[PDB]
Write a protein that binds this DNA or RNA. Structure first.
Lengths: 190, 181
DNA sequence: AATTTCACACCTAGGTGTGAAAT
DNA sequence: AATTTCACACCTAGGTGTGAAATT
């Protein structure tokens, strides 16, 4: 367990977290912003690794945004859990030297509210809080089967990456930051 | 017992009849048409490596004569370019994975820069090349098969010589739609 | 020269939030 | 109501040939 992970764009994640991060969710699938990007350290260069991402609920409560007080409040009890989906990195599996070579970005990752989705996108319930988790798994390609044991995986949880899944932005301050930092939203600047 | 089917065969043969030309730039240029294949007779449990390589057709330099609208031998071929091993991005993969859908080499770029380090194929302008496709059976400790489609042979150029080639590239490549009509 | 390189307009492809409309 | 979906304009990103200019 000597593998180290460094979250890229930490300052941007913390700026969003202070406001209370919101992530748009659609039927077709929406990319996260900011993109979850990491730097890998202490891996064996000859060993083959699988890089994974999963989303875990923060609490069992449904949220509501009050525009009068500009804050999030508990609306009621959480809706039933969404069918569990996982997202492997497109380059997985790959050698330890390949992962440590450059920053690993989960830019192809998409969030959806469609419970019946078959496009490999992450299914999330709108107005609920989620915690993105990052997993490094050691895998032997000569073996046709894979499973989880205590010594074959490591989980990395960055508290600043937690967000609320929404269909439209609630906090206007979040929209302002998304517009100002995401290049695809440059047409809305000024 | 492995069988390979060249996709877009009709488009390749139409280009070959005119004498296929591929643009070559410093930055790297995609081939048009894209080399796409269908795999058959592979073992679904066996691991395979899929490769692409370019071999010179002859040891001659070519020149296009606009008066007669034909290719002629200009002189002797330039020295061979620095060759490297080119694997499909998904290689290695199981036999069932390769046979599942059409295999394409769309991210494949041709360059005339001898000092290139971006993993692109280095070629000499005004020379005839033959693209070859390889299927290699991964063994823990013959397995090497080569598929050569004669219709995929082309002349590497910096600018199109035959106006008929340009016309076909414009008419069939979606990125050249702005030049239609 | 005869051949090669450059900025450029114009495509494809797909990622943005907007504000109306819909549920 | 409070929340979700739709067409849309406007971006980024990157693949085209064009015609001018340049070039061991």
């Amino acid at each position: 367990g000597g593998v180290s992970v460094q979250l890229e764009m930490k300052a941007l994640w913390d700026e969003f977290n202070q406001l209370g991060t919101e992530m748009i969710v659609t039927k077709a699938g929406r990319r996260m912003f900011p993109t979850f990007q990491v730097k890998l350290f202490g891996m064996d260069p000859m060993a083959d690794y699988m890089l994974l991402m999963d989303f875990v609920p923060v609490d069992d409560k449904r949220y509501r945004y009050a525009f009068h007080s500009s804050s999030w409040l508990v609306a009621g009890k959480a809706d039933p859990a969404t069918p569990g989906r996982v997202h492997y990195h497109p380059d997985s599996p790959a050698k330890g030297a390949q992962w440590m070579k450059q920053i690993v970005s989960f830019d192809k990752l998409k969030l959806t509210n469609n419970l019946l989705d078959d496009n490999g996108h992450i299914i999330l319930n709108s107005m609920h809080r989620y915690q993105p988790r990052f997993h490094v798994v050691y895998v032997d390609p000569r073996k046709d089967s894979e499973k989880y044991a205590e010594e074959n995986f490591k989980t990395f949880v960055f508290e600043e990456t937690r967000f609320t899944a929404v269909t439209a932005y609630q906090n206007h301050r979040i929209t302002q930051l998304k517009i100002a930092s995401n290049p695809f939203a440059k047409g809305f600047r000024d």
